[PDB]
Amino acid sequence: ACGYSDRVLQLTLGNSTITTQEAANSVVAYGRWPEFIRDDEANPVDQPTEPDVATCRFYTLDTVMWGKESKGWWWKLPDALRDMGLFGQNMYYHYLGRSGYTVHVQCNASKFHQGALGVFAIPEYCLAGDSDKQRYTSYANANPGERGGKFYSQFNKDNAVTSPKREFCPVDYLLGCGVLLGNAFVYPHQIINLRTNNSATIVLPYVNALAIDSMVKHNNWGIAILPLSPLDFAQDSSVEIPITVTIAPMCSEFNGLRNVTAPKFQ
Amino acid sequence: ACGYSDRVLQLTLGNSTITTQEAANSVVAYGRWPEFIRDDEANPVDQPTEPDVATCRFYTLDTVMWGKESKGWWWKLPDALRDMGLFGQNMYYHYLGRSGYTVHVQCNASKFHQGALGVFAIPEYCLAGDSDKQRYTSYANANPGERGGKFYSQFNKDNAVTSPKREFCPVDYLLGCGVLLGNAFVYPHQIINLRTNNSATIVLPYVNALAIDSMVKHNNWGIAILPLSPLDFAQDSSVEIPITVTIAPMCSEFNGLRNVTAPKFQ
Amino acid sequence: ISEV
Amino acid sequence: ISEV
Amino acid sequence: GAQVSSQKVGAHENSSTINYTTINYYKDSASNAASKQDYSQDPSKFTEPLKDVLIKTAPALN
Amino acid sequence: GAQVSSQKVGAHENSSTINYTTINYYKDSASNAASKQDYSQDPSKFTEPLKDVLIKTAPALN
Amino acid sequence: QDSLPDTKASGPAHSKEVPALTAVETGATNPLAPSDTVQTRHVVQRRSRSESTIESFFARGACVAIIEVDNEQPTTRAQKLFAMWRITYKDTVQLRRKLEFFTYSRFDMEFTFVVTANFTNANNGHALNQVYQIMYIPPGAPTPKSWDDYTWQTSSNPSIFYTYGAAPARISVPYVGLANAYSHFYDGFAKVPLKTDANDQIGDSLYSAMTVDDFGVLAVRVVNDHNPTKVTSKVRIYMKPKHVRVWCPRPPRAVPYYGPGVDYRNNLDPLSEKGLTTY
Amino acid sequence: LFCGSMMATGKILVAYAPPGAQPPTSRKEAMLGTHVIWDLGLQSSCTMVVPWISNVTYR
Ligand SMILES: CCOC(=O)c1ccc(OCCCCC2CCN(c3ccc(C)nn3)CC2)cc1
Numbered sequence A, B: 001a002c003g004y005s006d007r008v009l010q011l012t013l014g015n016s017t018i019t020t021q022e023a024a025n026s027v028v029a030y031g032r033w034p035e036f037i038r039d040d041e042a043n044p045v046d047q048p049t050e051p052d053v054a055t056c057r058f059y060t061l062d063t064v065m066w067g068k069e070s071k072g073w074w075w076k077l078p079d080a081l082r083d084m085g086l087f088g089q090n091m092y093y094h095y096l097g098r099s100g101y102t103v104h105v106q107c108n109a110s111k112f113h114q115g116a117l118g119v120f121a122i123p124e125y126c127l128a129g130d131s132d133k134q135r136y137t138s139y140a141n142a143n144p145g146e147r148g149g150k151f152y153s154q155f156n157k158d159n160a161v162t163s164p165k166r167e168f169c170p171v172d173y174l175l176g177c178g179v180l181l182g183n184a185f186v187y188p189h190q191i192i193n194l195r196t197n198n199s200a201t202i203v204l205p206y207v208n209a210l211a212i213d214s215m216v217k218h219n220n221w222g223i224a225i226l227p228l229s230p231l232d233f234a235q236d237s238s239v240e241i242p243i244t245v246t247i248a249p250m251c252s253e254f255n256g257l258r259n260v261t262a263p264k265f266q
Numbered sequence C, D: 001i002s003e004v
Numbered sequence E, F: 001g002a003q004v005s006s007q008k009v010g011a012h013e014n015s016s017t018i019n020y021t022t023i024n025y026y027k028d029s030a031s032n033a034a035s036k037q038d039y040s041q042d043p044s045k046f047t048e049p050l051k052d053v054l055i056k057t058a059p060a061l062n
Numbered sequence G: 001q002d003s004l005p006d007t008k009a010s011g012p013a014h015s016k017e018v019p020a021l022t023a024v025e026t027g028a029t030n031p032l033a034p035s036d037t038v039q040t041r042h043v044v045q046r047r048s049r050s051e052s053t054i055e056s057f058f059a060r061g062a063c064v065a066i067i068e069v070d071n072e073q074p075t076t077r078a079q080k081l082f083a084m085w086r087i088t089y090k091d092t093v094q095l096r097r098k099l100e101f102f103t104y105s106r107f108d109m110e111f112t113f114v115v116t117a118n119f120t121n122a123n124n125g126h127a128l129n130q131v132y133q134i135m136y137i138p139p140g141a142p143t144p145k146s147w148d149d150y151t152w153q154t155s156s157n158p159s160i161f162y163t164y165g166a167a168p169a170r171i172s173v174p175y176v177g178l179a180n181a182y183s184h185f186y187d188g189f190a191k192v193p194l195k196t197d198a199n200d201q202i203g204d205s206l207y208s209a210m211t212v213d214d215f216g217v218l219a220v221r222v223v224n225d226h227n228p229t230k231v232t233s234k235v236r237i238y239m240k241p242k243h244v245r246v247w248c249p250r251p252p253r254a255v256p257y258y259g260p261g262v263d264y265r266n267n268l269d270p271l272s273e274k275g276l277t278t279y
Numbered sequence H: 001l002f003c004g005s006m007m008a009t010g011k012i013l014v015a016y017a018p019p020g021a022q023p024p025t026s027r028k029e030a031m032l033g034t035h036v037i038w039d040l041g042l043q044s045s046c047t048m049v050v051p052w053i054s055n056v057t058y059r
């Protein structure tokens, strides 16, 4: 009653609040809300750290621009947040860390613009590489941090054998991983179709073969954003609109405290 | 019953445990155990961060050496812990922070050594300066971090007017602050007298004119260690034994989260 | 037996 | 039987 | 220890419920055959992961 | 003479307690298989052979 | 009963209720039935999904390996008097693709062994029936250097002694994972490069790979001392997952596999040419 | 176990760092993980428990 709607949401976590007046409802991945490790599923015996409001709040990543040639963007979790305030510090000071996430993807335009973003949350998003060499992508390349990576329309094999790039070569219609993109919809997702909605909101539970794992060694969720339908406007052949990704950790807990991990990203 | 004693203690906080077989009981400053801010004494309205085991554990500072000429050492809290793991990160990411402390001072020798350490926990330990210029000690000099500062047997006025040192000149019998050292015993304290005990253990409550304050701008407690009776051994005129200070934050809570404070210690 |  |  | 269940009879002989008998011979359950009596479930966690699940005759967006 | 016991079920099929049946065919118990239902015990005769066994929070030597 | 829902009789409509319209942007599939959009009759439905249950889908013994072992005069150069295979479902493609519809799995495993043999050469006399030893060597255990060295003593490792000509050998394996479920996909590394490392090889690892030995090996040999004439044998291993559970669905592999990970190399063009308005 | 003379005294820090970071080279780094400060005295021996802190259920 009163005047409520499927399109207007307010998300509040910690000292951060997001408003949206053009949502397309919101997704809870696999019907499961984030939760803490239960005593009967517990494995590390040491008393956990639960930083609560200091880590479970909204971090906004660097904005990417969507234009007519944009083939797509990808991110990995927890990696995109490794340098995010106290969440990042907690991740690198503990051997173990589990956390769920609220993902809020932002992209507004105008009633005369056109285009549709496919936003996909993929469990264990293993990506394909550069080379004749199998399973050879380097850690530093596998993990772009906040920057994320991109997709390509086709497979350019990194030829230079002698001093190899050791990078991923994610081809768009193959979801960067040897499968057809049209089936990516079996993964938790939303579509930002510009005539309908400004944004997508996906709530992610911790998903793993274990209750807790190494956040530095292993990414749990991949965020893939691909243009299902290309950006278009009026007749201006070189349109560009911003896409902004804001992500919040949820029910974060950490075990195995010691001196800080300093990975080598060179 | 069974075999228990005033001299043998085990202190456990977080993933850290201290044992001692030669204690002289332990002091709880002003009869008050550390506690969290109560709702009816609360002032900042934002939901606090309580890092618990990740910050409320024992940090061991760099060891100092006690020799026949050692006039004394001093430290300030929270300053001595500003770079200590996740406690330090929480201190610098929040405008407000309150915390109590367990202070454990360590100094063993042998039944043939001699000497007595006066260990004092002082609320608001304002120290005296260098100069003709009053209240002129610089922030970077007022705050030695983990290193602490020292005492002097006498007042050497920093003469160089033109490019002033802006340092403290803490004279030992004046407790570095214009009073007589013999009265420092009205402050919470223990004595490490080497024929009696290896160590001192003082539990400090948060003490302030406010329930919570800026930890970066203001130190709550000063730790002063002065040799009440000089170190002596056999006939060897240049004896030296280590003093080690281990400190644990207790009931730590933080308010006012934002981007990290990076003070200039140059 | 355990006839279901 | 001897079902335990 | 014999376990008795009804068969789902497809082509019925010209001759009602028919049964089959099972006995486990080994202590380790890994050694056991497959019961093949498998319960199903709703697809909704996949077909409808929405926080506000709405009814098909109403407007999806409101 | 059939003997019926519960299996400790590890990986559960998508289909509760499952059982297995045993029968001894021979008069000599040496011929029998291994029950593998083995009870355990305290290590104390090895970890603590002390005439006065003391409690861990008290001083070992007093 | 396990039959699917009956079709309800549905008549004409003139209303403000519009099941036919929706918004896929939400992430949802429209829950429609024939009666929401056309007039339907009552159908008592008897069909069922019995054969497409997870157990029924995997309830089949699939070929995962062909191990070849020779029985001949131990000469002195690289021979096949014994062989070793790392246990995996990835040397073959068919079962691999089926398991990979899902991210995680948990199950017991049934192994069946078909052994075939033949005479390698035109003729030197013949061979008396062979017994084969299939030994499981879990990670950590001593691996054989010689077809009849002490490791084959098998005091603690499980071994099967198969007689040629007998019904194919069969055993069952419990769920043996270090985790609560088997990961068909692992987006991570076994090691992390640290800023303080000496060479930057200390922290190097294969992407997606977890443990170095995974689940160990099957060492196979002919227990028989060699005949004068050589006999060559092949052991075909059929794997069946039983008492199966699976989590998190995935798109099936659309392009040819290129090694143990998700890497693709070529034949990246899975779909045929068909005109937009052609039936 | 301290097998020194009874006139000998000392305090020792023994520690356990769960995997993932740089293996400790300084007491400063070691202090930060699981640890016991052992004081030598009449009770001759000290016990540090290495708690089960693992990602996998079995190593
Ligand atoms: C590498 C990718 O594949 C997997 O993740 C994966 C996961 C699970 C799998 O299950 C196999 C694990 C059990 C390994 C072996 C355990 C014991 N085995 C035996 C043992 C004894 C004998 C005589 N014969 N076989 C044969 C299998 C196999 C592969």
Ligand SMILES: *C(=O)CCCCCCCCCCCCC
Pocket: C001, D001, E001, E002, E023, E024, E025, E026, F002, F004, F021, F022, F023
């Ligand atoms: C429950 O099983 C009681 C009834 C037993 C009937 C006779 C079973 C004959 C088969 C014996 C199986 C022995 C397996 C080791």
Ligand SMILES: *C(=O)CCCCCCCCCCCCC
Pocket: D001, F001, F002, F023, F024, F025, F026
């Ligand atoms: C107890 O065993 C009474 C039930 C017997 C059930 C039938 C057993 C059939 C197997 C007979 C075993 C004969 C062994 C010499």
